[PDB]
Amino acid sequence: TTCCPSIVARSNFNVCRLPGTPEALCATYTGCIIIPGATCPGDYAN
């Protein structure tokens, strides 16, 4: 489950994808989260 608590974070997170960066790296800096489970609510799945 790849989640993020804000559109602002989500945006630059996906922007970090385009240079060929692993979400793992981007999430950890951006603020987004990559969790094995945990069905994120509508404020973390944004």
* Domain map (residue ranges) of the chain: 1-46
- Phi and psi for 30 in degrees, rounded to 5? -60, -45
Q: Determine if residue 11 is left, alpha or beta; phi over 0 gives left, psi from -120 to 50 gives alpha, anything else beta.
A: alpha
Whether 44 and 4 have beta carbons less than 8 Å apart is answered as yes
Contact call for residues 25 and 16 (beta carbons, < 8 A): yes
Distance CA 6, CA 24 (A): 17
Query: If residue 28 lies in a helix (H) or strand (E), which one and from where to where?
Result: helix 23-30
Instruction: Tell me how the structure was determined.
Output: NMR
Instruction: Find the radius of gyration of the CA atoms of the chain.
Output: 10
Which residues are within 8 A (CB) of 35 and not within 5 positions of it... i.e. 6 or more apart? 1, 2, 3
CATH number of 1-46: 3.30.1350.10
SS3 34: strand
